[PDB]
């Protein structure tokens, strides 16, 4: 873990981390942008992927290729579905899955992309680093568990019920984590997903999201920065 | 266009093209494999993406970045939604959109990734090449129009219903083209999508696909090889 890649979807989700970096250098690939520098004593490349699975996948593949990233950490906001979660709480995604993949017609489990596992496991070392960071993390409650992704912003009770039917133990929902996870799997690169709650993915999710994005972004980022220091 | 990238999801969709190529070198990037050779005095890099949006997007970005591809052509099978489409018929995808993207909560149009256009237009020069290629297959059935993609295999007369609701003029549905399109958009690369019908995306789509993949792959491939010769 020499070079750490950190991927966030939206500017609000990377700004704090960017302000924390030293010797920052802007870099880009077509329309994607990133920032190369250091945090703690670690080389870090912080990328802005844009929203959704294709954007996150391409950005992640780029940083891995271009910078030989040793691991990848996703940061940002998400819909909270876990028992007892509140706005600002952080979830360490120990497993990630696509909630909107369905090739069941050919025998695959719901969410399973053909030729791949149904879920993607975050790296054991990185999970461990995140758990250690949680032990002294004061800004918010932290939990661990499953985060699922798909190419939609979920904002209905019916939408959440669909996802819980396939993923009963789900803790959070968003739109990039499973794409980043699947990309790292395919590129044999360890990763972990860190997200914080901006909403409940329910009928009010869009209204809550815009209000709580900055708080979710910050809490997620502060956890991510603790992890990087520890590596 | 001197270096052409050709992207197919499945071995069966690239096998003929691979056999047509000369001076072929195998290349890889993690679990992704491609073949760099020549076809008709063009440099061709033929990539096996794997199924679905993440896989297609990563393989496409990799080939653009590593090989400096001048354009990208997708080849493969798709479910026929256009009126009258038969197994084996080819669709030149002139426009592409994601059918399963939904950030409508924040005002975006159905299918539209935030900050991206709702649909992605294939390159004019490539579409005209496809149209010339089509005329060389005398009698053959070739149409032009909208192809939509999502991370699921459609095999339901009502799954189709709902797609048609959002995209009335839709001609075909599959799982990679909009990811390739979006990736090319973001990396400023011209592309065109060529697919052939393996099924009608209804309840029999699975058995139709199993039987007619070889046919759809072949017809798509032959069209793509002729397009390469026309650039
Ligand atoms: C503006 S779209 C939502 C962005 N924030 C994340 C997220 C927060 N809350 C939700 C998100 N994604 C889906 N459903 C939700 N309820 C997603 O990963 C997107 O990058
Ligand atoms: C084995 S999954 C189907 C593969 N073939 C394509 C396709 C054929 N027929 C359909 C596909 N995709 C979605 N719905 C369909 N009815 C997709 O792009 C996948 O790569």
UniProtKB/TrEMBL annotation, chains A, B:
Transmembrane segments: none annotated. Keywords: Amino-acid biosynthesis, Glycosidase, Hydrolase, Methionine biosynthesis. The keyword Membrane does not apply. GO terms for biological process: L-methionine salvage from methylthioadenosine; L-methionine salvage from S-adenosylmethionine; nucleoside catabolic process. Signal peptide: none annotated. Its EC number is 3.2.2.9. It is an enzyme of class 3 (hydrolase). Pathway: Amino-acid biosynthesis; L-methionine biosynthesis via salvage pathway; S-methyl-5-thio-alpha-D-ribose 1-phosphate from S-methyl-5'-thioadenosine (hydrolase route): step 1/2. It catalyses: S-adenosyl-L-homocysteine + H2O = S-(5-deoxy-D-ribos-5-yl)-L-homocysteine + adenine; S-methyl-5'-thioadenosine + H2O = 5-(methylsulfanyl)-D-ribose + adenine; 5'-deoxyadenosine + H2O = 5-deoxy-D-ribose + adenine. Residues 3-229 form the Nucleoside phosphorylase domain. Substrate binds at residues 79, 154, 175-176. Pfam families: PNP_UDP_1. GO terms for cellular component: cytosol. One of its GO terms (molecular function) is methylthioadenosine nucleosidase activity. InterPro entries: MTA_SAH_Nsdase (IPR010049), Nucleoside_phosphorylase_d (IPR000845), Nucleoside_phosphorylase_sf (IPR035994). Belongs to the PNP/UDP phosphorylase family. MtnN subfamily. Catalyzes the irreversible cleavage of the glycosidic bond in both 5'-methylthioadenosine (MTA) and S-adenosylhomocysteine (SAH/AdoHcy) to adenine and the corresponding thioribose, 5'-methylthioribose and S-ribosylhomocysteine, respectively. Also cleaves 5'-deoxyadenosine, a toxic by-product of radical S-adenosylmethionine (SAM) enzymes, into 5-deoxyribose and adenine. NCBIfam families: MTA_SAH-Nsdase (TIGR01704), PRK05584.1 (NF004079). This is 5'-methylthioadenosine/S-adenosylhomocysteine nucleosidase. It comes from Neisseria meningitidis serogroup B (strain ATCC BAA-335 / MC58). The lineage of its organism: Bacteria, Pseudomonadati, Pseudomonadota, Betaproteobacteria, Neisseriales.
